[model samples]
Target: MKVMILDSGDPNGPLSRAVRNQLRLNGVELLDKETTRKDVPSLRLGKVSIAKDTASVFRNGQTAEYQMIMTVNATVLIPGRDIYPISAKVFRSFFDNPQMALAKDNEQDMIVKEMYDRAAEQLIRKLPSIRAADIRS
Candidate 1:
């Protein structure tokens, strides 16, 4: 019943906050390290692992014909086994020049929200027994 969120290098990347907030909102509590500063808990720290990958989740890259494409990859591990890796791909209008669009548009938030929704949906299907911890154990 532990979850570990892996770092994706980009401090401000979408995956980090997206995964954390999405899971938290859904009642999956994060294990804090500050509380148990004296003795690190070995049993739960590495229980749940999530890593970021460069490849787009949607390998096909052929969506409704939008030019730009971006994707997020995620891995979820249960106690005894690992579930399937999930991928999310987003298609935008200007594929070649997306920096401006990504930076300037409010639509980016909506897109990320949709991606989070998709990610949460996948996690729910893969791990239905997880729940947030009300108090530290």
Candidate 2:
């Protein structure tokens, strides 16, 4: 099964690549993986938002609990055949004691990765149910 990914919004964005890699890792053969197009089996990646919130506040606001809210939307398409849409949103909160300043960024990065990974997982779960007729024009 050859699948092509097309993202007019962000063809080479981090979230897009994450989804592509996830699909490839799960055994989906991709065609023209380098570019975006509308005529083929298309994978469109939608909006992504990473919100940072202060979960707790210390005496001077120097110490707090930081939370991240990550959300992503995606669409799988076989052009005139079928369309499968998937979305993923996640929340992660951790204490920001400032033991290590860089740890905060690392945690945020990990959270983002996890969010996208889960979104990809959600999308791939539907692949097995896709019929050949759904992809034939």
Candidate 3:
């Protein structure tokens, strides 16, 4: 259950914690260092890709609802073997209007955080299913 999960997430934000939290929720222990040779497996996180698009326009045509398309990719590094890939994605939306500028801006931040949180949960869901025996290489 102990695995080496390399984190490339930001130090200033919650990126590094959420997935580990999910990993713990799955009863997996996180190893900071390799305990033995060719024994420990690892999962490496990669950059998140996002695309934003306008979801809808209000009847008055002064407001817009936008949606975010975000996806994350990870690599499960198996010792002395090849790599495995993982993809976790999420879709989120926010409502914005000129009247609530500052609040909406903060809502944007919140939505982004929630987006990553959702993706991390999805990524870690695949962790519990990883077994070296399942893959020949």
Candidate 4:
């Protein structure tokens, strides 16, 4: 599976790193890492964002919950100029406690990781089918 990863407009950035990490974990070879070629399979990552909001549900305003909607879009290019678009979106909600100031950052990072994990899994699952089709053609 020779593959090239496009710039993603965020080379070596956190989200890119997350996607690469997930791909490697699932045994996909990133050809860009070793060589550059136009004829190989390629993947272009598009916009990725964790849109978040906080809502106060308690009358005292001391209790609240955070909601995040994560989205990722990508395009896969095959040898025959075939294009496959992949997209994943996930929603998550968690309680926020004012008293946990020190842990807030950590918790936020965890939630973001969770979202990425889900999105990556969805993307990975689609790859096998794409490869199968490529073989059939």
Candidate 5:
């Protein structure tokens, strides 16, 4: 079986690619295009939506004082089965403090990287369930 990494247009973003790499490194064949629309145009009727816009819930910018939220939805196709669909969501916030000067000097990139690792770890945990055949076979 193959597992596809649905990008939700955020594929170019860290989370999407991270999930795809993680899946591939674990030996799961990943499909291209992280979209909600089915490959066939005639069958395309709906799309996936990601509601949150912010990358992190924590503060952003210099002091991290902004907020962002987003959501995502998608449709699935199965051979000889009813079309199955899936949806996912994430909420985040950004902080930008021009007034506050950092003594330690931390930026959004650092925070985002740290957050990315945490998120990736959480997703990695679920891989086993998707690859049961390796263990069972």
Candidate 6:
């Protein structure tokens, strides 16, 4: 399949590297041109956030406990079919020194990236099985 990858235009935010890598591993080709053909569909990576009031729960202490339930969204526009949406939610937890601000902050970044990659893998596993008829245009 020939495709493209989209992002939310954020420098400090997550990217679609996992999505592109997965697609490449699966033999999907991405369009290098500025424009794409009607017969091709593009994968767009969307929001990445922590679920509130539930998944983001944490404990306050010298050694605090934290939980990260990361969520991500993806979209695909097919030429002949309707817009397709896919999403992912990954759960992780850790206990460490709450006083060490940078460590926690940095660790969270690592966790988020790992979550991002896993979510990409999961979502792509369910990516649509397209055929010639799916994009006849």
Q: What's the lDDT for all of these models?
A: 0.42, 0.66, 0.72, 0.69, 0.43, 0.64
What would the per-residue lDDT of candidate 6 be over residues 1-137, giving only the tens digit for each residue? 44554443553455567666667787777776446456676677778777522323346423345667778777777667777777877887655545734444456568677777788778677667565223322
Off by over 4 Å in 2: 2-4, 33-40, 58-63, 81-83, 98-107, 126-128, 132-137
TM-score, predicted candidate 6 vs. hidden true structure: 0.67
Better of 4 and 6 by lDDT: 4
lDDT of 3 at 48: 75
Model 1 RMSD, rounded to 1 decimal: 10.3
* Residue 112, candidate 2: alpha-carbon lDDT: 70
Model 4 lDDT, full chain set: 0.69
lDDT for each residue of candidate 3 in 45-118, tens digit (9 for 90 to 100): 88779899888887877547788988988877777767777888899777766464445355677788888789
The residue-level lDDT of candidate 2 at 105 comes to 48
Question: Over 4 Å off in model 6, which ranges?
Answer: 1-13, 34-36, 51-63, 98-106, 132-137
Q: Residue 122 in candidate 4 has what lDDT?
A: 74
Looking at model 3, which ten-residue stretch has the lowest summed lDDT? 128-137
* Clash totals, every prediction: 0, 0, 0, 0, 25, 0
- What TM-score does model 1 achieve against the real structure? 0.41
**Model 2 lDDT tens row, 1-137:** 55665564665776777777887897776666555444556667767778888877778756477777777776677655656666677777776655634454455556677777776676566552334543322
Q: Worst lDDT window (10 residues) for model 2? A: 128-137
The sequence of per-residue lDDT tens digits that candidate 5 reaches over residues 14-129 is 66665556656766565554454333211111342333343333343323345433333334343233444433344444445544434443466655544554454444443333
* Candidates in descending lDDT order: 3, 4, 2, 6, 5, 1
**Highest TM-score: which candidate?**
3
Worst 10 residues of 4 by lDDT: 128-137
* lDDT (10s digit) by residue, model 4, range 1-137: 53555546776666677777778887776765525445566677787887888744667666477888988888777656567777888888777864644444456777788788788777666663334444322
Q: Candidate 3 regions off by >4 Å?
A: 9-13, 35-37, 60-63, 98-106, 128-137
